[PDB]
Structures are given as C-alpha cells and as structure tokens.
Amino acid sequence: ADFAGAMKAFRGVVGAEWVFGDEEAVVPWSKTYIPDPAHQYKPVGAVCPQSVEEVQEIVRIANTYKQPLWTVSTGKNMGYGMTAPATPGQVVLDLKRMNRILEVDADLGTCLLEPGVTYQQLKDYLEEHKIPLWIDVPDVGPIASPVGNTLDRGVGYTPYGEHFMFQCGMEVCLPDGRLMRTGMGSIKGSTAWQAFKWGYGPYLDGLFTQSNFGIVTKMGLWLMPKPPVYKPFMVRHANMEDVPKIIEAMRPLRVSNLVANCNLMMSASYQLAMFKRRNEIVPDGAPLDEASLKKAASANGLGMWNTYFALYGTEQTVAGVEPIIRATLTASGGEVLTAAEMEGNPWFHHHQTLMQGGLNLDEVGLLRWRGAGGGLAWFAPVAAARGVEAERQTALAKEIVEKHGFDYTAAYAIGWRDLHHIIALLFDKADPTQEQKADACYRELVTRFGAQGWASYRTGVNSMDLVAQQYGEVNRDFNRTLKRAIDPNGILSPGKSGIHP
Amino acid sequence: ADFAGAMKAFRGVVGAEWVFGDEEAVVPWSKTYIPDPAHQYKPVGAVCPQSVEEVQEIVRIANTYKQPLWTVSTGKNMGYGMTAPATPGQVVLDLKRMNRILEVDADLGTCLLEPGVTYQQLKDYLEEHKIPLWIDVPDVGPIASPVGNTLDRGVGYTPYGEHFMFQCGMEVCLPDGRLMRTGMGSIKGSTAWQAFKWGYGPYLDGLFTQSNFGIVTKMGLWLMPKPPVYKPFMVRHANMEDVPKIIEAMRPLRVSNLVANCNLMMSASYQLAMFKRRNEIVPDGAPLDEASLKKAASANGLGMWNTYFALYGTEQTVAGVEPIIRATLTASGGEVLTAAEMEGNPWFHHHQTLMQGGLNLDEVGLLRWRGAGGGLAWFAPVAAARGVEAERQTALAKEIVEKHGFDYTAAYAIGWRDLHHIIALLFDKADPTQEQKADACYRELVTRFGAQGWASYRTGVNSMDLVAQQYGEVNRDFNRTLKRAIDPNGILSPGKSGIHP
Ligand SMILES: Cc1cc2nc3c(=O)[nH]c(=O)nc-3n(C[C@H](O)[C@H](O)[C@H](O)COP(=O)(O)OP(=O)(O)OC[C@H]3O[C@@H](n4cnc5c(N)ncnc54)[C@H](O)[C@@H]3O)c2cc1C
Ligand SMILES: Cc1cc2nc3c(=O)[nH]c(=O)nc-3n(C[C@H](O)[C@H](O)[C@H](O)COP(=O)(O)OP(=O)(O)OC[C@H]3O[C@@H](n4cnc5c(N)ncnc54)[C@H](O)[C@@H]3O)c2cc1C
Ligand SMILES: COc1cc(C=O)ccc1O
Ligand SMILES: COc1cc(C=O)ccc1O
C-alpha cells in the first residue's frame, strides 16, 4: 500500500476536510466494544464522500495505490466491530454523507435509498409526507442504516423483520470502479427495479451481503403498508427451564404464519441489563443466580423469559387467530398479556415500539453492566426452530460464559423455521484482564458450538476468521476464488467474513 | 472437445446402457417446441447417472476431455428448449435417475430432494405418509421437477408460489468435481440446513439459479402446512380492455397480503387454446377477433380475462378478508365466483387444483392450436404491478404477434409487487415458413420490449443471448468474469443465460 499517495489523491476527490489521515484524526472511527487485547482492530484513515462519482474515483485511486478500503454506511455495528477493519492498514470508506432518499413509491410500497439514509430519516420522511407505510427497525439507538443493516442481513420485529428478504434491486460500485445495477435496474429507465427481485440469469444481490465484493451505492427496499389495527402482546414464562416449551409453542404458529413478525424471546438477565447495572442485582463476585434474577424480574413484572409478538390487520383478522395463539401459548405455561395489562411497563413499551417499526429513545444500558462497562460482543449462533436445540444451546452457552466469569444474557429472535440465538457477552473492557478473559470466552463459544454443529449468522471483526473456520473448507476456497476474480488488487474490505485476497 | 474419449469414459462410470452417443440414440433428448429454422439447438449425446459420486466422476472426465455438459433435472422445460443445449456440441447431463426424497420434516415443514424427484412423486410421498403439507406446482403435465423448476426460478399458484423464495440449502457439484453445501449445510451434521437460508458470508444459492456455475445435486425446499380451509375463487372481467383495472384492483390486495397466492390472470384466447383448436373458433386466415372470442368465452362461462385466487386458513380468517376482496374486485367490473357457481366448468376445476398444489392430469392442448401445431415459445417479460404497464405491454405484444400473423394468447402471473407477463407464441412448427415467421416475431418481441424498458424473467435457449443483450453490458461482463473463474474449462452448459466461456 502507498498510504500517503492514496490519501493525497483522496483529498483531491472529496476535499481535504473529508479525509482523516493520521492517528489523532481517525480517533472518531477507532472505538469498539468487542475485546481486542492486542489493539489490532483499528483503521489508519477515513474518507467521507458525498456522491457515487466520488466513490468511483476513490476506488480507482485505491487500485492504483493498492490501499484497501473498509466500507460502512453509518458504521453503528455495535458489538460487531463498529468501524474497525478486520485487517491492519485499511482506510474506512464512510458513506454517511450519501444520505439521499431517492424514491418512495406509496402504491407499490417500496423505496430506493443511499447508504447514509438513517432509519430516523426514513421514518420522518414517511410521516412528513403522510405516506401510510412502515419501516422495520433493529433494536438500536438513534443512528443506524437500512442499507448497512440489510447488507449484514440484520433483523427487526415486524412481518418485514428478515431484512434481506425485503431488499429489491441495488447499485454496486465494483472493485474496478464500474457501476452495476442488479435485478431489472440495468435496463435503461426500467420502472421495475423495486418490483421484481431476481432479474435474468444468476441472482447476484446476495454476493454483496456479508461480503467484500462490492460497494453498495443504492438499495431498494420493500415497505409494509400500515395496518388498520396493530395489537402487541407479551408472553411471560416463569422458569429458566421453559426454553424448549416456548420454542415448541411458537414454532407451529410461525410455520403456519398465524404470527408473522420476528419474535424476541428475551432472558430476564438481558432485560434487567438494559436498565440496571449488575451490582443492583447481585454483589460483584457472586454468580447471577436464578433466585435473585427471578425476584428482580418479578418485581418488574417480568418472567424468566418474556416473548414479544404482534398481530396486524383488522379487528376481524386479529380475532381470527388470537384465540388459537392464546390457547397454544397458555398450554406451554405462558401468560399472554396486552397493553392494558402492562401499563407503565418499560419493557412492554420497548417492544410495542419495535413491533410497529417505531424509533426507541436512545440509551444503550447494556454497555454499563459489569464494573466500568464498555465490553460487548455478540455471539449469534443459528438453530432450527426446535425446543431441544434451544435447550442445548442455552445450556452450553451458560456453561461457557460462567466458566470464564461472565453471565448469560441472551435473546432468541424466532424466525419462520429458524432461531437467531443472540448472546451478549458483557464485560468490563477498561479492565485489561477482563478484556483478555472475554476474548478467551468468545473463542471457546465459537469453537465448542462448532463442534456440536452450530455456527453464527453474523459475527464481529475479531472473530470473522474463526467463524469462517466452522464452515466448510470448500466454501472458504470458493469465496476466495470469487474474491480474487472480482477484486484482483484486494482493495475492498480484506478479511470481511474471513475472506482474504 | 474430444467427444469419443469422453463418451467412452462415461460408459465406464454409469454403464454403456446409460450413455447415448450418436444421432439416433440422442433422439429422445432432441425434440423442441421453440422455433429453430437452422436446426442448431440439439445435443450430441446424453448421460444418465444415478448417484452424486457418478456426477462427480463425469465432471472430472468432462474437464479432461473438454466436453461440455448441459445439466437438466427432468428436462421438461417446454417452450424454453426442453433438453436442447444453447450452443452446439454439448452432452445432456440428465439427472432423472437421481430421484431420491432424502428428508421430509413434518414439524418444520421442509424437505430435501434430489433433482430427479418429480412433483407427482413428492405429492404421493406426502399423501402416503399422511403428512399434512402441500406442494406448490407449476401448470405442467405429469412430469416436472421441484429442483429443475426452482433453479429456473419458476412459479406456482399457492402462497408458496414464488419458488426460489422457499428454497433453503443446496448441494452443488462445482466445475472441478468438488461438492459444496450452501447455508448451514457445510457444518458437519448441521440440523439447520433447511431452517436458515443465508448462512455466513456471501449468499451463494442465487449463483446457481438460471446459471451455469454448478450442478445442483441436492436442494432443500420449504412446504406449506395444509390449511383447515381452502377456498378458491374466479374473477370474471367482460372486456379485453379491462387489463389495467384488474391489475389496479389486485395490487393493493397483494401488497397488503389479503391475497397471498400467485394469481393467474388468464386471457380468453389462452383459455380456449387449452381445450380447443383455433379453427373451432375462427377460420384459418381470419384474425382472432374480439367478438368471436367473447362469444366463445361466454358460451363457456368465461370473461375476456379470468383471474384466479384463493384464501387459506379457517372459516373465520377467510371471512375476515373476503368482503373487502369482493368489494375491491366488484368495483373494478369483476364478477367474483366460487365453486358452487362454477360446477362443471373445466377452467375453474383446473385452477382450483393448481391453487391447492394439486396435479392436473391432462395433455397440453396448447400444442395443437394452429395448423399441425407443435410450436410454442414463451415470451415472459416482467412488469411492475401497475395497470398502465400491463395495458401497454398487452398492446405492444398484440401489435407484434398480429403483424407476424400470430395470435395474442397470454396470462399475467400476479406477484407481490411484480407481474410475470406470460405470452405463448403458438405456431405450426411443421410448416417451415411458419417456423421462420415465429422466429422473426420472437426477435421483434424481445427487441421492441427492451426498447421500452421491459425484459424477460426467463427465456428459451434460442433467445438467451438476445435477452442478455437487453440487460447491462457490465452485468454481462461480470457474469463472464465469474464463469471463467468458477469453470475455467467452460464445461458447464455454455450459453445458458447468454453466459459464454
Ligand atoms: C443493544 C443493541 C441492540 C441491537 N439490536 C439489533 C437488532 O435488533 N437487529 C440487528 O440486526 N442488529 C442489532 N444490533 C446490531 C447493530 O447495531 C445493528 O445491526 C446496526 O443496524 C448496524 O449498524 P449500521 O446500520 O450503521 O450498519 P453499518 O455498520 O454501516 O454496516 C454493517 C456492515 O455492512 C457492510 N457495509 C455497510 N454499508 C456497506 C456498503 N454501502 N457497501 C458494502 N458493504 C457495506 C460492512 O461490512 C459493515 O460493517 C444491535 C446492537 C446493539 C448494541
Ligand atoms: C402449458 C405449459 C404450462 C407451464 N406452466 C408453467 C408454470 O405455471 N410455471 C412455471 O414455472 N413453468 C411453467 N411451464 C414451463 C416448464 O414446463 C416448467 O417450468 C417445468 O417445471 C420445467 O421443467 P423441469 O421441471 O423438468 O425442469 P428442468 O428442465 O429439468 O430444468 C430447467 C433448467 O434448470 C437448469 N437445471 C435443471 N436442473 C439442474 C441442476 N440439477 N443443476 C443445474 N442446473 C439445472 C437447466 O438450465 C434446465 O434447463 C409451463 C409449460 C407449459 C408447456
Ligand atoms: C437478531 O439479530 C440481533 C439482535 C440483537 C438484539 O436484539 C443484536 C444483534 C443481532 O445480530
Ligand atoms: C409464471 O411462469 C410461467 C407460467 C406459464 C404458464 O402458466 C408458463 C411459463 C412460465 O414461465
């Protein structure tokens, strides 16, 4: 890499005030929450363009100077690396200034977005124009990107919660600086770019998700019509061991699509961690015992597991399914509760907001759990939607985290036929011993889960190689063949998803 | 290519009795219904393996001898080329004997299939085991493949009608002879291969749809639970010119998901062609005039457009949406009819079967429309689900087919935000002048649609290059870059989707 030559050329493209080219200037891009005992996940520069033409020029320069770029949209991948690159020596290509809402089609229920568009911005746009469409939001703070989130295949909590399913068309700047539109978008003045996903020939959009094959400059997204009626529910289960029965109850409701939104099944420990520090619940040095958890949860109107779902449509369609749902969940030991029973309950309010695609009030309490706080890494294994799988994964995760002196703080995001088991590894990052222990714990989670046949849907920059190692060697080789063909100079996000030039 | 050396080595793998290696022996793989005036779409051999290990050996030999393989599952791509390869000198790799149903998961609603499994076979398997799951079938005759259809991104008529959306996990033999499993499948003894679509890192399954980058040897598919209640409907519209009003009435019902199955909006001419020859309707030499069509359709209980939809659930969920659906469609000039009104109507019966994923036992009447018959080519442009687009595409297609002496015989398959406009170009293939005219007509359809911003979702081997030409030059280059990297010897289906080594 010729770093100095690249950065000088980048100033010529975007202006000197949008290039950040030394240790002090790149501080805003360098903070992470994942464990990093060797201090190895850090950018060496950042560049912030406002147009796709600037992106193209930047890519051309990256090739000439052999200077890799780590592309982000808004860069709020918290617990997964924020804007830290996977390998040393990279410049962050921060697309936050490319924040234009290009189209919103009220009739077809679609939009077309630049990467820097935020969820807040899109929701404001819809409301200001009185367009009766909803968004589908992850459980994040004030800033996050539909484009960035979708490209990492993230998740929200309406019927449109599996974000990548609802993507339709994209524009990519390929590593040589040429633009390519997927689906119907390469037909000049196509009116169907946001209407038909697949196009003609090989379906390419998935190559640009969790990958380093292209820079997405525009993305189409389907949006759900606002329903006449929205009815949120909470199911409370009393015992830690209820895990398998909850999944077995929900599975039929989801496979038959009586419930259609992604359902967060939240542990009491996670819920408490959102609003309380660990030392409000148990002494430092003591385990997070189930009696203390149960007492604390009960005092706050929570069970040991609390699962959130909603119904959408009319009073009549809601009444068609609500009885069967109530029967199935009550038979599993759950108490089904509505807004009228959960008045003033901040967890119910939190999920009632999420499940209509509302924006919650900034405040990530999770970062202050243990000691000085500041340590969070997601460990996010997949399971089939089978109670026995959830039972076993809960047991193994708890065993491993507790062996390293950490707590089990987790949720299951229940999907159609799958679960995303979301495990927050919360630690005191400011204590270097605790950061080292969290690193060791994380490695043990990945390795031992992999040995039982389980691996992650998504992971942070510090674990992308170790997670890749859980999946097949042929897969690893095939990804590398694609990388080398698409990006011969290896200038896009080396190490993303364990893919190296 | 060294054809003789390749075919000798193939006999060693599968047995001499499963290699077909001269003009006479390959006759069963040679008949097509598309126009082919130069007789250029034809295989030079066929090989029929029964195991994945045989496939892998075949692929190794194909590399050694530089002998291209044109891979099919059951090969019933009627109107798209059957088993004829896109370029000369290819051997059909016919996977019909790999017909094992590997798994069916009743609780998660999934299955895992080899390519040769037919729809009939899978339906029989479900029925015989009393498994309360349905299939989703295209409107084909007795033999077709869930795998082959899904890989060409085909369509059926239940809520699971957009077939590729419901695929989950695949195994592929790569061009070098190695097997790769997508999604969660490359984790040994993963139990989530049919549970979670995306896996980790780039999403690859779409690369193996409408493509020549691999041979699919196993594919997973989600299956819909059988609903307590199934209620089919037919909407009759009186006038040829109703097209835009029908799309505008159905679009909100589909965008809001009050109707969830893919809806065939059938022209009267197509419907009549299913069961009648053209000279039962008008004289040879006369146009298929709207008054003759209306009279013939009316005598059969058909409108000029007849649109089929269904509701699935309980008596109460159906009652939740049926009034709104009826009001929307009646306001558009439609008459909404149910089984009780359509007793003895063979078209209603045909669609009522399709919309519950039933197998129609029938010959393909369409192949006998004009003269000696035998000519069929699908022209299948996409539209957004907007009335004005359907109006304009119907007008243009009518203009073009009638200019060349052919009829407009078409349907729209209404999707969520899209339409597949399915235009059957029916001709007398046994008359060489008519075959030439149909060839010219088809070229004009593709070219002139492309100039208005419209192009095909799928096409036949004789037009794959011309359809590729309607999409972007960068797309074409990118697909060629992938092809050369993935299949360096160019031995898998050269010319599929216009992708050439
Ligand atoms: C308390 C908490 C709760 C959370 N809840 C959720 C949740 O419910 N669901 C969820 O999905 N996540 C969740 N997250 C994780 C994360 O914060 C969000 O997913 C967030 O939306 C990701 O950041 P972002 O939108 O800024 O995307 P980015 O950080 O901009 O993008 C993510 C990644 O995509 C790639 N990328 C982004 N833009 C492009 C581009 N234009 N071209 C190519 N590649 C690009 C890069 O690899 C990048 O690192 C949570 C995090 C926390 C701390
Ligand atoms: C009257 C009529 C009505 C029809 N209605 C419909 C309809 O409603 N919906 C619809 O979708 N189609 C329809 N068709 C078109 C077609 O007949 C079906 O799509 C049929 O299912 C395709 O044949 P097949 O299943 O044998 O697949 P195949 O012909 O085996 O496969 C199709 C293509 O996929 C690729 N392929 C197949 N198997 C493999 C593999 N294992 N590895 C890699 N590539 C492979 C090849 O390119 C192959 O040519 C209709 C046809 C007619 C004549
Ligand atoms: C469903 O995916 C996620 C959910 C969350 C929090 O709810 C955090 C990280 C994730 O990847
Ligand atoms: C929805 O796709 C198709 C439908 C048909 C017949 O109804 C034929 C070919 C197709 O591609």
Author numbering:
A (entry chain A), B (entry chain B): 43 to 543
Passage from the reporting paper:
Enzymes of the vanillyl alcohol oxidase/p-cresol methyl hydroxylase (VAO/PCMH) superfamily are found across all kingdoms where they perform a range of metabolic functions. These flavoproteins share a conserved FAD-binding domain and a more variable substrate-binding domain that enables interactions with a range of substrates. One of these, the 4-phenol oxidases/dehydrogenases, catalyzes the oxidation of para-substituted phenolic compounds. A fundamental distinction is that the oxidases efficiently react with oxygen producing hydrogen peroxide whereas the dehydrogenases hardly react with oxygen and typically employ other proteins, such as cytochrome c, as acceptors.
The enzyme was therefore named as nsVAO, although we cannot exclude that it might use an endogenous cytochrome rather than oxygen as physiological substrate. Its crystal structure confirms that FAD is non-covalently bound, supporting the notion that removal of the covalent flavin linkage does not drastically affect the properties of VAO/PCMH enzymes. The protein exhibits a narrow tunnel leading of the flavin re side where Val181, homologous to Pro151 of VAD, is in direct contact with the N5 atom.
